[PDB]
Amino acid sequence: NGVGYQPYRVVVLSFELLHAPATVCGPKKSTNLVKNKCVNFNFNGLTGTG
C-alpha cells in the first residue's frame, strides 16, 4: 500500500491533577555514602551537615 495509506500505531498519554497528594513521581539521582568526614547530606528532604 501507499506510504500515506500505511498503517500506523499511535499511543497517547494524558494528564490529570488533583489536590490529593501526587502518586506518579519519577526518580531522582543519588550518590554514594561517605564516612568519617565533614559533609552536607540530604535524606528524603531532611537537610543537614556533619
Binding site: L18, H19, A20, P21, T23
Partner: protein, 46 residues
C-alpha cells in the same frame, strides 16, 4: 487516611482488660475523599 493497630491475647473475654499499650502505624492512604459515616461487615454460613 491513616490506620494504627496492634494485637494482644485475652483470657478475660467478658470485658476490656486494664493496662497500657501503644498502637503502631502500618499503612496510609492518599485517597483525599471525605468521610462522614461508617459501617461494619460480617460473615455467616447459611
Amino acid at each position: 487516611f491513616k490506620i494504627y493497630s496492634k494485637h494482644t491475647p485475652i483470657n478475660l473475654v467478658r470485658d476490656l482488660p486494664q493496662g497500657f499499650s501503644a498502637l503502631e502505624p502500618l499503612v496510609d492512604l492518599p485517597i483525599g475523599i471525605n468521610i462522614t459515616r461508617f459501617q461494619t461487615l460480617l460473615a455467616l454460613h447459611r
